[PDB]
Structures are given as structure tokens and as C-alpha cells.
Amino acid sequence: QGHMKRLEVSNQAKLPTQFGEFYIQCFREKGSKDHLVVFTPNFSQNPLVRLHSECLTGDALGSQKCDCGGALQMALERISKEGGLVIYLRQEGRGIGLFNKVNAYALQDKGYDTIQANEMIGFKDDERDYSVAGEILEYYRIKKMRLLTNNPKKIAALEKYAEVTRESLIVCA
Amino acid sequence: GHMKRLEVSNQAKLPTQFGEFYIQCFREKGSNGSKDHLVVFTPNFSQNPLVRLHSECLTGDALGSQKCDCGGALQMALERISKEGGLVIYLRQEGRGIGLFNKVNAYALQDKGYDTIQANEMIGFDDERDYSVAGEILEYYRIKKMRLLTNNPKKIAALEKYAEVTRESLIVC
Numbered sequence: 002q003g004h005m006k007r008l009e010v011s012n013q014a015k016l017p018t019q020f021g022e023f024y025i026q027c028f029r030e031k032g033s034k035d036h037l038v039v040f041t042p043n044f045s046q047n048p049l050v051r052l053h054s055e056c057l058t059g060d061a062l063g064s065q066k067c068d069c070g071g072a073l074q075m076a077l078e079r080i081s082k083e084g085g086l087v088i089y090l091r092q093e094g095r096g097i098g099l100f101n102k103v104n105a106y107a108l109q110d111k112g113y114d115t116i117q118a119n120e121m122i123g124f125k126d127d128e129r130d131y132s133v134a135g136e137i138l139e140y141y142r143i144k145k146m147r148l149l150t151n152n153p154k155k156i157a158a159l160e161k162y163a164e165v166t167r168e169s170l171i172v173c174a
Numbered sequence: 175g176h177m178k179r180l181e182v183s184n185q186a187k188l189p190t191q192f193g194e195f196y197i198q199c200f201r202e203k204g205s206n207g208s209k210d211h212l213v214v215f216t217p218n219f220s221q222n223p224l225v226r227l228h229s230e231c232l233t234g235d236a237l238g239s240q241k242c243d244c245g246g247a248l249q250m251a252l253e254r255i256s257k258e259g260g261l262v263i264y265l266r267q268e269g270r271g272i273g274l275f276n277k278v279n280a281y282a283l284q285d286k287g288y289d290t291i292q293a294n295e296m297i298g299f300d301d302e303r304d305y306s307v308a309g310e311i312l313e314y315y316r317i318k319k320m321r322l323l324t325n326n327p328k329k330i331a332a333l334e335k336y337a338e339v340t341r342e343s344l345i346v347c
Contacts, residue, residue, distance in 0.1 A: 014281035018238035025233065027278040034208070035274035039237060057264075060236040061248060062214060063191040073236060089232075099210035103199040106186035 007031045008136055021081040028140075030133055038137060039077070040086040049085030051076035051149040051170070052134050052159070055093045058102075067173035075172050076149060086141070088134050096128030131155055135162035176203060180211075180310055188214070193256040200311055208266060213311060214252065215261040224260030224342065226251035226323040227308050227333065230268045233277075242347040250346055251323055261315070263308050271302030305332040312336045 002010040011027040016039070028036045053076060059069030076087050094102035101122050108118040119125075131154070138146070138159065145164035148156060151171075159165050175182055183199035195214050202209035228235075228251060234244030251262050269277035276297055283293040293299075305328070312320075312333065319338040322330060333339050 009275065011275050011278045012282035014278050015285050016233055016237065016281070017240045019240060020238050023237075025237075025278060025281075027275045029273075029275045035268070037232060037274065037278075057212065058188060058197070062188065062195075062197075063249075063252065065189045065191065074238075077238065093207070093210070098207040099212065100181070100183050100199045100201045100207075103183040103186050103197060103212075106188075106197075107184035110187050 002140065005136060005140075008133065010140060018077070020077045023081075028133070028137055034091040036091055036133065036137070037089040038086055038141075039080075039089065040141075041080055041084045044080075044084040044086065047145045047147060047166075048143060049080055049083050049149060049168070050138075050143070050146045051080065051085070051087045052131065052155050053087055053089050054095070054129060055089065055091050057093060057099060071172040072170065075170065079149065085147075086143075088137055090129075090131075090134065092129050095124070096130075097122075097124055127154065129154070131158035135159060138162045177310055177314060179203060179307055180314075182314065190252070192252045195252075195256070200307070200314075202307065211266055211307065211311070212264040213261055213315075214255075214264065215315075216255055216259045219255075219259040219261065222319050222321060222340075223317065224255050224258050224323060225312075225317070225320045226255065226260070226262045226344075227305065227329050228262050228264050229270075229303060230264065230266050232268065232274060246346040247344060250344065254323070260321075261317075263311055265303075265305070265308060267303045271304070272297075272299070301328070303328075305329060308333060309336040 009029040013024045013026045016023045016025045023039050026038050053073055056069035058064040060073045064070040080087060093099045105118055105122050108121060143163055147166045147168050149168050149170045151169055156165055156167055179202055181201045181203050185196045185198045188195045188197045198213045200211045228248060231244035233239040235248045239245040268274045280293055280297050283296060317337055321340045321342045322333060323342045323344050325344055330339055330341055
């Protein structure tokens with residue numbers, strides 16, 4: 002589907018998974034990051050949408066940490082039963098990346114407290130931008146949606162691209 | 175703290191559905207955040223440890239894909255190192271070093287029934303994966319002998335340069 006302001010869209014492809022049959026489609030922001038949307042063949046005019054920030058440990062390694070453990074899996078189970086999309090953004094560790102997140106873990110392991118840890122690695126504010134997700138929503142022509150999130154910054158960002166109903170994602174509560 | 179090509183994080187504990195691992199991030203110095211390689215390992219592994227040199231594959235690794243290209247491979251390797259002792263060296267080299275965007279387009283061509291010669295040409299496909307950073311990781315952990323869980327002669331051939339390698343076959347499908 003071509004390009005829209007340094008965002009390239011791949012063809013869609015079938016992906017059979019243990020959760021069921023999805024389509025996937027890559028959105029390459031050129032800079033340069035390959036985001037992915039995973040969607041059920043049919044979804045409604047008010048689909049369940051999960052905006053997921055990459056978390057390698059929870060997503061791929063079966064982490065049991067509450068930071069992101071089980072979250073991707075829960076979202077894929079939910080869109081599978083109910084229809085919808087997962088918008089998989091490549092923004093590991095709130096935008097500061099895996100390296101720093103691993104050091105944050107190791108600081109936690111040694112028993113530093115939250116503020117000491119942040120201070121030592123350097124993480125000031127959450128550096129994530131979600132406007133790229135807005136473009137993906139326009140591409141699929143989603144006007145209203147149920148967003149699976151407990152993050153008001155994600156809610157706040159997407160409400161200028163569509164009508165958002167919040168829905169909580171409690172994996173670890 | 176640096177090495178030759180890589181910067182190394184602190185080691186961090188990761189509790190997983192497979193057992194308790196340690197993880198350590200190896201970042202290519204002067205990389206944007208897209209070369210944060212990760213080693214996942216069991217505490218105090220042997221002198222002939224099981225090693226999986228894993229090329230990032232989002233669909234298999236994170237999305238529960240049932241495709242034989244990479245479906246189940248990461249899970250199998252984590253189950254195995256947890257029982258036997260060892261390491262997964264997770265290299266950020268999605269799509270044979272060509273990337274996720276191209277991989278999804280390659281999938282879409284297979285969906286349409288193009289044959290393998292046709293798909294390659296149309297995608298613009300050489301296997302661009304370098305494994306020499308895995309060598310520095312092996313040197314860092316002082317691994318001079320290993321059982322390499324793979325069916326790829328190029329992975330074997332490359333790691334033979336740094337250590338004595340015994341091949342172990344990976345059977346997922």
C-alpha cells in the first residue's frame with residue numbers, strides 16, 4: 002500500500018498461530034523501525050485494539066515479571082476470541098531500549114529503590130511517541146475503537162485519530 | 175563496559191515459565207538501539223554447554239506462529255537450556271539480515287503461490303547475516319567448547335573459528 006510521509010506499508014500476509022489465524026502487515030518508519038500489526042481477518046467498526054510496546058522479555062522469553070509478562074499473549078488471545086488488532090510498536094523500554102532496561106533490572110535485583118535506579122540509568126520521562134499508531138489506524142480506516150490499555154498517554158494520543166473507549170488490561174493485578 | 179564491537183550490560187535475573195534465567199544485553203557500540211543483542215543463560219553452565227544461536231524472528235518468537243521457518247524454535251531452545259544448562263544468544267538480525275518488512279512481503283508472495291525462485295527475485299534477494307558478534311560473546315563467557323543447536327552450516331562454520339563445536343539438530347516440525 003505504498004508510503005505516507007516516511008511510513009512504508011508492506012503487503013499483508015497470513016500468519017497461522019497457536020492463538021488462531023491472523024494477518025500481519027509491517028509498517029516501516031524511515032527511522033528505521035519495523036512495526037507490525039497483527040489483525041483478525043474481519044474486525045468490526047468498533048474493534049478491540051491493543052497498542053503494544055515491544056518487550057522482548059515478556060513477549061518472547063516467557064518472563065513472569067509484571068512489567069510486561071503475559072501481556073502480549075493476553076492481547077492475542079483476546080483479539081482472537083473477539084476480533085481486532087495488535088499494533089506492535091518497536092519502542093523497547095519506554096523508548097530507551099533493551100540495554101538500559103536490562104541494567105534497570107540488575108539494579109532492582111541488587112535492591113536499589115525505584116528512584117535510585119532511574120537516576121543511575123538516566124531515564125527521565127517516558128520517551129514513547131504514539132503518533133505512528135495514529136497513522137496505522139487511518140490506514141485501516143478505524144474511526145472508533147476499544148483500546149486495551151491502562152495508560153492515559155496512549156488514550157490521549159489516539160483520541161485525536163479516532164473515538165476511544167478504554168478497556169483495562171489486567172494480566173498481573 | 176566495552177569489548178571489541180560490543181558494550182555489555184549488567185547481568186539480570188529473569189524468572190520465566192521455563193525456569194529462572196540470567197540475561198545480559200550486548201549492544202553494538204555506536205548502534206541506534208536496533209543492535210541490542212541478548213544472551214539468556216542458566217546459572218553456572220558446564221564446559222560443553224548447549225548454545226542456541228538464535229536469529230530474531232518476531233512471528234515465531236513472540237506471536238505464536240506455527241510456520242516452520244522459525245515457529246517453536248525459541249521456545250524449544252529455552253526449554254532445552256533450562257533442563258540441560260546453557261545459553262541462547264539472541265541476535266537482532268531479523269529476516270536473514272534483510273529485516274521484517276521484507277520478510278512479511280516474502281510471506282505475502284508465498285500466500286499468492288509464487289515459487290521460491292520467483293519470490294527471491296521479486297523481493298530482491300544473499301543471506302546477509304554476520305555471526306562474528308556471537309564470537310565475541312563466546313569469548314566473553316570463555317566458552318571454548320559447545321553443543322550448537324542448529325541446522326545451519328554457516329552458523330556452525332562461523333562459530334568453529336572461536337570454539338570447538340559439536341552440532342545438535344533442531345527439530346521443530
